């Protein structure tokens, strides 16, 4: 905004985004799906839910 050899001035426009939490979860586990093997009319099959 101003520039002299002994004096300056500046302006900055900052925008912020604040997330507001509804709930926070701390003690968490990932799932892993191993399923089961089945043998049927000669064919080996992997089964999963």
């Amino acid at each position: 905004t101003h520039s002299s050899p002994t004096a300056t001035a500046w302006e900055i426009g900052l925008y912020y985004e604040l997330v507001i939490p509804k709930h926070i979860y701390l003690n968490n586990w990932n799932v892993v799906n191993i399923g089961h093997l089945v043998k049927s009319a000669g064919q080996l099959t992997h089964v999963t839910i």
């Binding site: 089961h36 089945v38 049927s40």
Partner: peptide
């Protein structure tokens, strides 16, 4: 149309000695 197999993840049921 015959009834097929049942699974239940129980290891103890499938033990072989």
């Amino acid at each position: 149309q015959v009834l097929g197999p049942v699974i239940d993840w129980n290891v103890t049921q499938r033990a072989v000695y």
